Design a protein around this ligand. Sequence first.
Ligand code: APR
Length: 173
Amino acid sequence: KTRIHVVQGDITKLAVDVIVNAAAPSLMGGGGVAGAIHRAAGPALLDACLKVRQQQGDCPTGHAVITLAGDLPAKAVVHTVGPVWRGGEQNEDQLLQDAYLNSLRLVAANSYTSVAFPAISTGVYGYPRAAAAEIAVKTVSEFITRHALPEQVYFVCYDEENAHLYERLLTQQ
Ligand SMILES: Nc1ncnc2c1ncn2[C@@H]1O[C@H](COP(=O)(O)OP(=O)(O)OC[C@H]2O[C@@H](O)[C@H](O)[C@@H]2O)[C@@H](O)[C@H]1O
């Protein structure tokens, strides 16, 4: 689209309004993007995530929260919790959808115009890469069709295989 883009590389480098984190309910850092993001952002991010936890407890699956972004070139970080993949009969598809939706909603609610997304749930949470990307693209596309904000959406893909996957699902629209 004019509004949705596929970029390949490291999400932490993206100068966008908001960067999206594939988080765990704890919100306390992790391995995949979560680690990359935290490391890049610096200690302020963690302090902020603590404050949130302190205030709302664990972030439930399919939901999302927004914080400052510290040393990141972004203005804010949205932490969202993807589902753990359990074979597809445990409402996973819906919950992944919700993750994308609630994220977008928060970006908008906070008057942000641009947002970057990683491939939520496809790493350690073990979501089949292809089914996931389908939901991501469908959900985001349908949403931006209904809404002025966010104006710009970036799908950040960590490898070429995934990048191509997205790139063509997008043309399937
Ligand atoms: N710097 C990066 N930029 C963009 N994408 C990345 C990066 N590093 C990894 N990825 C990709 O981000 C996607 C997200 O998968 P994960 O980061 O493993 O997160 P997720 O599957 O949603 O499960 C999250 C779980 O792992 C921890 O990282 C996190 O705290 C939580 O416990 C995967 O495609 C992974 O390749």
